Amino acid sequence: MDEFEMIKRNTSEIISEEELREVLKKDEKSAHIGFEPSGKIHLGHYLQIKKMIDLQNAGFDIIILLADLAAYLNQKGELDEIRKIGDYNKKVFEAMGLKAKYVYGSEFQLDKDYTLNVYRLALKTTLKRARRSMELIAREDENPKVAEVIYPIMQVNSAHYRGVDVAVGGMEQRKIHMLARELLPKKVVCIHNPVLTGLDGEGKMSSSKGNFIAVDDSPEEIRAKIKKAYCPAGVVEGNPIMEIAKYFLEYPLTIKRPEKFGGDLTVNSYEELESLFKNKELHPMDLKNAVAEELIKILEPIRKRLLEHHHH
Amino acid sequence: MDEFEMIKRNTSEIISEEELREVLKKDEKSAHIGFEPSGKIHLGHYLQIKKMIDLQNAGFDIIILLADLAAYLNQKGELDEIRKIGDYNKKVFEAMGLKAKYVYGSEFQLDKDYTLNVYRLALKTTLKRARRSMELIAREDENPKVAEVIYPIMQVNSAHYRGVDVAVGGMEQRKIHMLARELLPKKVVCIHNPVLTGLDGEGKMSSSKGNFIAVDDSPEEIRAKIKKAYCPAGVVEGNPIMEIAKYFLEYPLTIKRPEKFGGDLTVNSYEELESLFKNKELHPMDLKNAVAEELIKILEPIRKRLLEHHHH
Ligand SMILES: N[C@@H](Cc1ccc(O)c([N+](=O)[O-])c1)C(=O)O
Numbered sequence: 141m142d143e144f145e146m147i148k149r150n151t152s153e154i155i156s157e158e159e160l161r162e163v164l165k166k167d168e169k170s171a172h173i174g175f176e177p178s179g180k181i182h183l184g185h186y187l188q189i190k191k192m193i194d195l196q197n198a199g200f201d202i203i204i205l206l207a208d209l210a211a212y213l214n215q216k217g218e219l220d221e222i223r224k225i226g227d228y229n230k231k232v233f234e235a236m237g238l239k240a241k242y243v244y245g246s247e248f249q250l251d252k253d254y255t256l257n258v259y260r261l262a263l264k265t266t267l268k269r270a271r272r273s274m275e276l277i278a279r280e281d282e283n284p285k286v287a288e289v290i291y292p293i294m295q296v297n298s299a300h301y302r303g304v305d306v307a308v309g310g311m312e313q314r315k316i317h318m319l320a321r322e323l324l325p326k327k328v329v330c331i332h333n334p335v336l337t338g339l340d341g342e343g344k345m346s347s348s349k350g351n352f353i354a355v356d357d358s359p360e361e362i363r364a365k366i367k368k369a370y371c372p373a374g375v376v377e378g379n380p381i382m383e384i385a386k387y388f389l390e391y392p393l394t395i396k397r398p399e400k401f402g403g404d405l406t407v408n409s410y411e412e413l414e415s416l417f418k419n420k421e422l423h424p425m426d427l428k429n430a431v432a433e434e435l436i437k438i439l440e441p442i443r444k445r446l447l448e449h450h451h452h
Numbered sequence: 453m454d455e456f457e458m459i460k461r462n463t464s465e466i467i468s469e470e471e472l473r474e475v476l477k478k479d480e481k482s483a484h485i486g487f488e489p490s491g492k493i494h495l496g497h498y499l500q501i502k503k504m505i506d507l508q509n510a511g512f513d514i515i516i517l518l519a520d521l522a523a524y525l526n527q528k529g530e531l532d533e534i535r536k537i538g539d540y541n542k543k544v545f546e547a548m549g550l551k552a553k554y555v556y557g558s559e560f561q562l563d564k565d566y567t568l569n570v571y572r573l574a575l576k577t578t579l580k581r582a583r584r585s586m587e588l589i590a591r592e593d594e595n596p597k598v599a600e601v602i603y604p605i606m607q608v609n610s611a612h613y614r615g616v617d618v619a620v621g622g623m624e625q626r627k628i629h630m631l632a633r634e635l636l637p638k639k640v641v642c643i644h645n646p647v648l649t650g651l652d653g654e655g656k657m658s659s660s661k662g663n664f665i666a667v668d669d670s671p672e673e674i675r676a677k678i679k680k681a682y683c684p685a686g687v688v689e690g691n692p693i694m695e696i697a698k699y700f701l702e703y704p705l706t707i708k709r710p711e712k713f714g715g716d717l718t719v720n721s722y723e724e725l726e727s728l729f730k731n732k733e734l735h736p737m738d739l740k741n742a743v744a745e746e747l748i749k750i751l752e753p754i755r756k757r758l759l760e761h762h763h764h
C-alpha cells in the first residue's frame with residue numbers, strides 16, 4: 141500500500157486522483173481542513189483528523205483552520221467566545237497526535253484584499269448555487285440570512301488565499317468545493333471523508349443533534365451510548381456500530397463471545413466482519429461489546445491527555 | 453417658507469419630520485447621498501443634487517458618496533473604470549454649483565472594521581428582505597448573484613460608519629433605508645425624492661433605459677427629446693413633461709403661444725399650470741415648447757462649464 145492508497149483508504153471521493161498524484165510528486169505540499177469550532181469533538185472530527193495524519197505521514201504540511209468567522213456567519217455566537225472554543229479544539233487535535241499549524245480564519249479573512257476577493261466571487265456565484273452549497277451546513281433557520289450565502293464564498297476564497305494543494309472535509313463540503321474548483325484559477329484537490337450516521341440511526345452524526353460519541357467521553361458513557369445505538373441484525377447500511385468498526389478499529393479484530401454463543405471470533409478485516417454480520421453469524425450485542433471496548437482503548441490516550449490538563 | 457419647508461419642497465417623503473426638526477436645531481449637521489457612477493448625468497440626478505443644495509443652504513455639510521464598490525457589486529464593471537466615471541460625475545456635480553466633499557466608497561468600505569460590521573448586519577438581514585430591498589436597484593439578471601444581497605447591507609453600514617444625520621435618495625432607496633432605521637443604533641433621517649418618469653412614459657427614467665435628458669444634452673437634443681415625449685392632453689400622472697415643469701422650472705412662468713392659440717400665458721405656480729393642462733386649456737405642443745426652452749436655459753450654465761473644460 142503506497143502513499144496514494146494510504147491517502148485514499150476510507151475516503152468517499154478524491155477530486156481528482158490524477159491531480160492528487162501530480163501533487164504527491166512535489167517535495168513541498170500542503171493540505172488544510174477547516175472546522176467551525178465545536179463544544180464537543182466527536183468521532184466525525186476524529187475521522188477527519190486521522191485523514192490529516194495520513195497526509196502528514198505522506199509528507200504534507202498540515203494546516204488546521206479554526207474557522208471562527210465562518211462559525212460566526214453560521215450563527216454559532218460571538219467571535220470571542222467562538223475563538224475560545226477554537227483554542228479548546230486545538231488542544232483536542234493536539235491530543236490526537238496531530239502535528240500541525242493552527243490558524244484562525246479571522247486572522248486573514250478580514251484583510252482588505254481578502255474581502256475584495258470575496259466580493260469578486262460574489263459576482264460569479266448565484267444565490268441559488270450558494271444556497272444549494274449550504275444545505276448540509278447551514279444552521280436551521282426559518283428565515284435564512286444573508287450571512288448564509290457569504291459563508292460559502294468565504295470558504296472558496298480560503299483555499300485560494302492560503303495556497304493549499306489539497307482541501308479535506310466531509311462530504312457535506314463537496315458542493316462548496318466544486319464551486320471552488322469552478323471559480324478559482326488553481327484547482328484545489330479535494331478529499332472528502334464519509335459522513336457518519338448518528339447513534340440512533342435517524343440522521344447524520346452532528347454536534348447539534350446530540351447523536352455522537354465524543355473523543356473524551358468516559359468509558360461508561362461510551363458503553364451506554366453503544367448499547368442504546370441502532371444496530372439491526374444483518375444490516376450494514378446506516379448502521380453506526382458497523383461504521384465505527386470500519387473507520388476506527390484495527391484488524392485483525394478478536395471479538396470475545398461466550399462459548400455458548402460461538403466463542404471468541406477473530407476477524408482479519410472489516411470486510412470479513414461485514415460478511416459475518418450480514419449472514420447473521422455475528423449478533424449485534426457481541427459486535428457492540430467488541431466495538432465499545434476497542435473504541436475505549438483507541439480513545440483512552442486522547443481522554444487521559446485531556447485529563448492530565450486538570451491533572452489526574 | 454422656513455428651512456424645514458424649503459427642505460420638504462418637492463420631496464416624496466421625510467422619515468420622519470419630527471426627527472428632521474430635531475436635526476435642524478444643531479449647529480453641525482451632515483447629509484449624504486450616494487450614486488453608483490453613471491456614464492450620463494441626467495435630470496433624476498439633478499433633482500437630487502438640487503435637494504442637496506437645499507440642505508446645504510439650510511446649514512448642512514454635504515457629502516457626495518461616489519459609490520464605486522456598490523456599483524461593482526451591481527455589475528457595472530471593473531472598479532478602476534467605475535472610479536474614473538465617478539471622477540467625471542464629481543465634475544458634473546461641481547458644475548451644478550454644489551459645494552460638497554466627495555468620497556469614494558472603496559476608500560473606507562473595505563476596512564476590517566467596516567467588513568466586520570457588514571457581516572454582523574448580514575446575520576440580522578434575511579435574504580428575502582435583502583432581495584426585496586433591491587427590486588428597484590439591482591441590475592437585471594436571470595440568475596441573481598450573491599453580490600445582489602451584499603449591496604443593501606453595504607449601504608446600511610455606509611450611513612452608520614460615516615455618522616450622517618440625514619440620508620437622501622430616490623424613492624427606489626426606501627426599503628434599504630427602512631432596513632437601516634430598523635438595524636442601526638442611531639436612526640438616520642431619510643429624505644426621499646420622487647422618481648421621474650421616462651420620456652416615453654413607459655417606465656421610470658434611468659441611465660440604462662435611454663429614456664432621459666442629460667444635463668449636458670445639446671439644445672437641439674433637448675428639443676428633439678421633448679418633442680417625441682409622452683404628453684397626452686389633460687393627463688398629468690406619469691406625464692414626464694409636466695414633471696419637468698414641476699421640479700425644474702421657475703414660476704411665474706410665461707408660456708409663449710401664437711395669438712391664434714390664445715396668445716402668451718403667464719402661470720404663477722405649477723399648481724395653476726396643472727389646472728390649465730387638466731382642463732385642456734393648455735395644449736401639449738405649447739407646454740412642450742415652453743418646457744424645452746426654459747429647461748435649456750436652466751441647464752445652459754452646466755453644459756457650458758463642462759464645455760469650457762474642452763475649452764469653447
Ligand atoms: N465548512 C466547514 C468550515 C470551514 C472549512 C474550510 C474553510 O476554509 C472555512 N473557511 O474558510 O472559513 C470554513 C465546516 O462545516 O466546519
Ligand SMILES: N[C@@H](Cc1ccc(O)c([N+](=O)[O-])c1)C(=O)O
Nearest residue numbers: 486487488519522557606607610
Ligand atoms: N443605492 C445607490 C448607491 C448608494 C447610495 C448610498 C450608499 O451609502 C451607497 N453605498 O454605501 O455604497 C450606495 C444607487 O442606487 O445609486
Ligand code: NA
Nearest residue numbers: 165166167168
Ligand atoms: Na528534493
Ligand code: NA
Nearest residue numbers: 477478479480
Ligand atoms: Na453656535
